[PDB]
Amino acid sequence: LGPQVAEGENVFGVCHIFASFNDTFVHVTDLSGKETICRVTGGMKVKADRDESSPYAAMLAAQDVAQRCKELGITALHIKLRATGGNRTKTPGPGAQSALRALARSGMKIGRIEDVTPIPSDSTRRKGGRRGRRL
Amino acid sequence: VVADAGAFLRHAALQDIGKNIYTIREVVTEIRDKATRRRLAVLPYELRFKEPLPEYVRLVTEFSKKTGDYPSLSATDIQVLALTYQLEAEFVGVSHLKQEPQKVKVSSSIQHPETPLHISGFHLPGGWITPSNIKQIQQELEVRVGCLTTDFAMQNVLLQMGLHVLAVNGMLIREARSYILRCHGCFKTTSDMSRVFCSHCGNKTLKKVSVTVSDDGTLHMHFSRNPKVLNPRGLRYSLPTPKGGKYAINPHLTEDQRFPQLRLSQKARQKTNVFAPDYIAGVSPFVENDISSRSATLQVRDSTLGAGRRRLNPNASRKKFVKKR
Amino acid sequence: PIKLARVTKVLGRTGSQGQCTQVRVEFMDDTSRSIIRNVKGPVREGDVLTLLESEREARRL
Amino acid sequence: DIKLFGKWSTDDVQINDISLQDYIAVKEKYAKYLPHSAGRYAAKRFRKAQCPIVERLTNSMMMHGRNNGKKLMTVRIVKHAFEIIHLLTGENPLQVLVNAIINSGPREDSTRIGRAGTVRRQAVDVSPLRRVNQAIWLLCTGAREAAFRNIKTIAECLADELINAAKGSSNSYAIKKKDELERVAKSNR
Amino acid sequence: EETRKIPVPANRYTPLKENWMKIFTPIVEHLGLQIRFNLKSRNVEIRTCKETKDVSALTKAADFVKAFILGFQVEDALALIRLDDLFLESFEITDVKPLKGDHLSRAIGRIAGKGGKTKFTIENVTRTRIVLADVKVHILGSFQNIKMARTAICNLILGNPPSKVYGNIRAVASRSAD
Ligand SMILES: [Zn+2]
């Protein structure tokens, strides 16, 4: 099962790596992006909410999603790194970096790295008050 | 084949290339590197020590101060130059060498002296750094006697007077591309690129001028025809009164004013080396910072730290809540 | 499975009371696996050890 | 040839364990007529490994208080034990001694790592010299515990404990102590 | 063969030029990668070659050079080359607390403290490296160490004095089984 493409040419997928401040999401799609091939969250691998956003969970997610692409036949992936964005933090965290490193480790060719986070032009009001956020 | 200390610093094992290996005691005994003294007792002993003649060091100095390089030269450097002179005079005929060398020819350009040309990794518009090329990048690499000099002054004087010299590469070199510092008040040139005050009039006025010397013995130097280089923008500013004591730092107007001794502690100047075999056993990935010592409270910094801050003009506006040391 | 060992270099003294020695171990299975372990008692440079399990790695970083 | 008390050979012995081969020094040059030497072995570090292991066994079983100075008595006890080991087993007493010391020595020790208050121990490896020392100490302790209040004799007790430790059965004090120490070392992690 | 390009700002050109050989020597010797600096696009470009030893070394090189460009010292990103579990969390100072003007600047001050000492103090407790861009904070270290440093920094820029910050971060380091 998979595309009828010769061994020379490779097929491309887009791996939405979304590392929020609670877990990670691995949404492998077509180059169009409409239909999903796979998505491995942090919570599907570790049975603990404390370890949900751990780099170990992202590493396991990247390994499992790479196994899923090898079972179908995707050999090279473009990367769209993402953070929570918007009003919240814009920079992707350690989970995205760990997932990208683990996916590059498991024999997978890397195409274009793109930092696509929903950066607002002008934000709405912040989640916290005037006092602050994060302890 | 007269070996200078630059080949010994670079582990240039060209002992099999040549046969007339001649060295000085004071070009090998001053090296503080441990690996060089380690390999010195391991390397095959066919090098031998030879002393120059006072007449020949006198002649070498005589035309070296006509080349305009005599302040840049050192005593053991003159030993090496006149040793090569004596060897090539005693083996080869002396008619090959020419004295009172050629004049300079001036041809300026619009390029800045800080343009990053002839850097290996830098490429304008392909120039790549490959592990096949990491052994190749030494310098501008192009029969019996020669030199293993790495300093530009040695190459300059040896090529102006006319000896074929070589590099860590086995083949003889052809062209010498480098930079020099020229005073723009007294017009005296120094081959030492590290210094910042000129030897003649002592002002903080040395500026970079590029020099290319061909194999014939002809030298041409390029100035920069750019108004930014010779600009009196950040030069006149109000100076503080000179303070004394153990803690006073002075604005450094002369090359030899006595500064108070303000050194760093050993823990403050430890840099983490990562390829040590026992680095992985470290409880922390990094060398711990020093905050306990008195030097930490006095905000003593290294000479390297804060280099672009000095390049800002004092007559400007900084950030409101920042203080410049 | 029990594997033989070798002492390559003694590193230091670890533990609460300074009772353990952190040491580097070379394998006698003809492999170059130099693994840093913790031992109890007197060890010197050139000693030979008996490991009950090898998959465990001691306190690194 | 040098014979232990003039009767016991020292060339027939074979060391099963590679780890204890360099510290069990009884084989060729270290063979002595008497275990008693009165030579220094604790003057500097690692000097007691050079000492013959029969002298180590001698020095380790007079350790208890009321016999803390008697050493000719100790080598007499070792002699009686070696005679009755020969007449029981039939092998050389030094061979079965080496076997008992090898099979009695622990391989992993639990050790307090952390602070005062954290009782969670971590399992660490064991030095071969300390393994030899602990093996001899456990053999001597079993010799004491088997000979407290009985007709059963102390040299005979050391012989019985040595044979039980060498054949690996769960009857020697050293064997059961080593087994419980190994299982708690495995359980700690 | 694939490649990664990373940009450099105008203020980071000179530290790149000075420390160039210390950058490209471990890239080309231990990792076996081709490296150049495109001056027109101002990008450090690293590509794999035929004699690259293994995969994921290109990502190690990219992390090394990007950490150097963000402001970390060359040794602190050589640590990224050697070690495996090292990451980079960075965040804006105005993220946790809405600060405007001079107040914001004072927050930067109490991340540095006098002489930078407070910053260095965190680097002794959390065993991390921290770089302050003009409104941005970058942390390099292990995951729990990065989280510890981030809690310390966010405690600093919510108004808490450095003494409470040192006490809390040392207590957390004590309970961290270090
Ligand atoms: Zn001048």
Side-chain angles (χ1 to χ4, degrees), chain B residues 182-188 197-203 205-206:
Chain B
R182 188 196 186 194
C183 170
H184 66 76
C186 64
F187 312 112
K188 188 66 63 68
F197 298 99
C198 66
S199 304
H200 183 76
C201 71
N203 310 320
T205 186
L206 291 170

Side-chain angles (χ1 to χ4, degrees), chain E residues 44-78:
Chain E
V44 182
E45 315 175 316
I46 305 171
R47 55 190 261 201
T48 61
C49 59
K50 306 326 182 162
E51 68 275 16
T52 311
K53 206 73 192 174
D54 58 355
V55 298
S56 183
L58 189 67
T59 307
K60 299 287 96 176
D63 276 352
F64 163 62
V65 190
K66 184 192 284 184
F68 176 82
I69 299 299
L70 287 176
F72 290 94
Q73 206 172 113
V74 58
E75 309 306 316
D76 310 333
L78 287 181

Side-chain angles (χ1 to χ4, degrees), chain D residues 12-24:
Chain D
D12 196 71
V13 294
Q14 198 67 59
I15 313 297
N16 297 115
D17 197 351
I18 300 103
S19 71
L20 294 201
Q21 188 268 347
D22 63 80
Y23 289 148
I24 299 192

Side-chain angles (χ1 to χ4, degrees), chain B residues 19 28 30 41 92 127 174 180 207 211 218 276 281 304 318 321:
Chain B
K19 293 160 186 177
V28 66
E30 79 279 18
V92 176
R174 178 78 31 87
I180 61 157
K207 286 183 176 291
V211 170
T218 47
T304 305
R318 58 214 96 180
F321 284 98

Side-chain angles (χ1 to χ4, degrees), chain B residues 21-296:
Chain B
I21 301 146
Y22 293 95
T23 49
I24 311 292
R25 286 81 55 213
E26 293 84 4
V27 308
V28 66
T29 47
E30 79 279 18
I31 303 169
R32 295 283 153 87
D33 193 76
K34 266 77 71 176
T36 54
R37 294 300 51 71
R38 174 206 62 90
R39 64 168 173 80
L40 173 68
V42 179
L43 272 173
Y45 310 99
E46 69 250 31
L47 57 93
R48 69 212 82 158
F49 292 164
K50 192 64 64 68
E51 281 67 354
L53 194 69
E55 189 192 295
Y56 293 10
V57 299
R58 196 189 321 103
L59 198 54
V60 161
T61 47
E62 272 294 327
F63 64 92
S64 78
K65 55 198 184 262
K66 306 267 302 171
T67 57
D69 292 322
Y70 186 56
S72 304
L73 265 64
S74 296
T76 75
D77 289 350
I78 297 157
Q79 301 272 30
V80 172
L81 300 172
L83 184 54
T84 316
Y85 189 87
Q86 201 175 329
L87 294 174
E88 204 267 350
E90 186 261 322
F91 285 174
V92 176
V94 301
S95 59
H96 190 196
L97 61 84
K98 199 254 182 182
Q99 69 272 13
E100 200 268 325
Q102 301 96 308
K103 304 313 291 174
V104 296
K105 30 169 178 170
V106 166
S107 56
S108 60
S109 59
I110 200 167
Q111 282 196 328
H112 211 78
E114 298 299 319
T115 53
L117 74 164
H118 275 56
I119 308 299
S120 51
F122 291 172
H123 153 268
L124 268 297
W128 291 92
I129 307 302
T130 71
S132 56
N133 285 114
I134 188 54
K135 188 207 62 63
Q136 293 292 109
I137 306 144
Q138 282 76 61
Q139 209 42 72
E140 286 91 6
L141 298 177
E142 276 94 13
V143 190
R144 184 203 52 81
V145 65
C147 295
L148 294 174
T149 61
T150 51
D151 198 19
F152 171 71
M154 295 299 102
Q155 288 171 42
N156 171 6
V157 58
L158 282 153
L159 172 44
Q160 287 264 207
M161 71 76 58
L163 291 176
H164 54 282
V165 298
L166 73 164
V168 61
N169 193 4
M171 185 63 72
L172 281 298
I173 64 171
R174 178 78 31 87
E175 286 183 300
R177 186 86 30 91
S178 68
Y179 300 153
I180 61 157
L181 300 171
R182 188 196 186 194
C183 170
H184 66 76
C186 64
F187 312 112
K188 188 66 63 68
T189 56
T190 54
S191 299
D192 189 20
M193 283 280 323
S194 59
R195 59 154 58 246
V196 66
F197 298 99
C198 66
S199 304
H200 183 76
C201 71
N203 310 320
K204 202 166 185 152
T205 186
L206 291 170
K207 286 183 176 291
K208 221 176 288 183
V209 162
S210 54
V211 170
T212 309
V213 179
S214 67
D215 201 73
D216 193 0
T218 47
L219 75 165
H220 62 316
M221 65 182 179
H222 298 284
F223 306 140
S224 166
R225 192 217 290 111
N226 204 8
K228 275 174 92 178
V229 184
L230 278 190
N231 199 248
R233 180 57 80 92
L235 284 175
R236 193 205 180 170
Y237 59 96
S238 49
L239 276 160
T241 59
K243 310 301 197 334
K246 295 183 285 291
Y247 305 141
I249 62 170
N250 283 303
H252 185 73
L253 292 164
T254 62
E255 60 200 291
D256 69 346
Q257 70 177 3
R258 214 184 295 280
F259 276 112
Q261 209 187 34
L262 285 160
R263 294 183 181 180
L264 289 171
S265 54
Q266 297 317 291
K267 198 208 295 151
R269 62 184 185 89
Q270 283 182 357
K271 309 225 177 303
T272 187
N273 73 308
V274 74
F275 301 119
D278 57 312
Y279 163 76
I280 193 57
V283 60
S284 309
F286 294 100
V287 174
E288 282 137 10
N289 285 305
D290 180 70
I291 57 171
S292 62
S293 73
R294 275 306 306 258
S295 58

Side-chain angles (χ1 to χ4, degrees), chain D residues 6 84 131:
Chain D
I84 190 166
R131 190 206 314 283

